[PDB]
Amino acid sequence: KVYGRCELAAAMKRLGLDNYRGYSLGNWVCAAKFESNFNTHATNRNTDGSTDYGILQINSRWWCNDGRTPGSKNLCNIPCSALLSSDITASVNCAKKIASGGNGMNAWVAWRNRCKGTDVHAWIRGCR
């Protein structure tokens, strides 16, 4: 499914991402925008042989197991396929785990590059 900006913001808010680990909601919406363009089915093969999955592009070498990545740590303890549904719950739960790390949102390259230090409130401006 391809979410609309406000719809994703509402969903993220219900799942408790607003101010999670000190990051206001707009950060998570921004991240989703640049990581997958709000597409729950986005998949991106990495050079190192890993693949990023879903709305928050979670990596098969460290976070979920896809059954084809040499040395998967599967720290979220979930199959990567669970990250491809229209329901963003599994992706949010794993993202919570990743951002609980000392580096927070820095784990997402797109966030680091396009969202960090910007007016993240613009991502939820005009929403319900």
Side-chain angles (χ1 to χ4, degrees), residues 31-44 46-51:
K33 173 70 180 171
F34 302 112
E35 290 288 346
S36 59
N37 201 21
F38 304 151
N39 188 359
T40 60
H41 224 107
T43 62
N44 292 324
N46 295 299
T47 187
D48 67 358
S50 62
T51 297

Side-chain angles (χ1 to χ4, degrees), residues 4-44 46-67 69-121:
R5 179 172 72 89
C6 297
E7 181 185 21
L8 176 68
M12 277 181 163
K13 189 174 194 159
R14 279 194 307 270
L15 285 181
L17 285 174
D18 193 17
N19 287 310
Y20 184 75
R21 284 282 284 143
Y23 292 96
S24 71
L25 185 64
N27 282 290
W28 301 95
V29 175
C30 187
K33 173 70 180 171
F34 302 112
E35 290 288 346
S36 59
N37 201 21
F38 304 151
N39 188 359
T40 60
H41 224 107
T43 62
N44 292 324
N46 295 299
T47 187
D48 67 358
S50 62
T51 297
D52 298 339
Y53 292 89
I55 198 150
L56 263 347
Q57 283 294 281
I58 290 167
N59 187 267
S60 76
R61 184 156 270 139
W62 296 92
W63 308 106
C64 65
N65 172 30
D66 64 359
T69 310
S72 181
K73 297 179 170 243
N74 189 195
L75 256 15
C76 281
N77 190 208
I78 51 153
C80 299
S81 61
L83 301 183
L84 297 174
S85 91
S86 54
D87 164 22
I88 62 170
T89 312
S91 286
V92 170
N93 282 348
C94 182
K96 283 187 194 178
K97 285 182 177 73
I98 294 170
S100 76
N103 303 318
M105 290 201 72
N106 283 287
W108 281 285
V109 190
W111 176 86
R112 213 171 72 229
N113 293 350
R114 321 282 309 276
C115 303
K116 184 163 191 160
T118 71
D119 183 22
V120 291
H121 286 107

